[PDB]
Amino acid sequence: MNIFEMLRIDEGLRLKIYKDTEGYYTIGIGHLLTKSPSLNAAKSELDKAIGRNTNGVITKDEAEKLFNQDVDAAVRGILRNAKLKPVYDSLDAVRRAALINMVFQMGETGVAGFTNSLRMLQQKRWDEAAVNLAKSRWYNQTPNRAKRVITTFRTGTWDAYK
Template sequence: MAASPGAVQYGAAAPDFSTQIAQMKVDATQTRVHASDLTSSETMKEALAEEEGVRLTVYRDVAGYSTVGVGHLVLPEDNLRVGDTITYEQALEFLEQDLKKAEAGVQRLVGDLPIYQHEFDALVDLVYNVGEGNVSERESPKLNAAIASADYEGIAEELHYHHAAGAKANGLVYRSERRQAIFMEAAYDDPRPVEIAVAGNLST
């Protein structure tokens, strides 16, 4: 007798629900997850490009470091000097390389502390901007203490970095405000005031 449609097939392999559950991707915008499960969002990449700009000619940043692309600090292996130019594709390659380093730095920084996507993004911006060394326990003890105690508000308070080469930089003030807004509210918009110039052009 043939089994009717929908009839239970005894002896058939039972579905492995534990595997199915493990394969389900948790929505990190709604649930805090382990940092190792996260990478920078596309929205964060756009915000980062806005902050750093995209420059194809090697220049010196406010701290005097040779820089190119999306805030990429020129390394000896890049074989580039101030005044040299790169392609847009090279700029994107540098960005992806630097993002991977920053993401790994954030993963080491937060350890097992679960975080939202936007919290991860804000911390990636921090590490990308100031370097992993500057968020170490020695250099940023309050930030590390907040992470250790799972004090998310305390973490947000420690995301401000305003100085470059020993001087306060207005651009870093706005960037810090944006970083904190990303961390606390998932608000990626640029906080800089926009004014209408006399000629009718937008200016900041």
């Protein structure tokens, strides 16, 4: 198990524009296109992302290309963020993947706002951090995925994904 397989499990794969859990236009492996309610706006974002005039449909190769970019972007987002980088640095490789997962899902700014949870994680108070992470809109809107990520933070194992 690794961060790519982990996120493939949590995000799934769809080759045509669709709406994610928040109702936002998305494609591929959880690649958010826009928060705009306009499908045309979403299609324009897609054309720009891929580099060609699409029909709202991409290939698997193109989906995996955006995925690679997006995972790299989540890591870059962590490392340039002054609140997230120290937490990431303090973590083992399995829990580092759980933090990348969170940033992939809700963005650098979103995760950096989890101040109290981040502190508990850096203190390695795993059960307490797990309880704190669940006290969130994130957990309430996507509880099964949040549970998997939180179990990964709690145990430092891949038990939730195997």
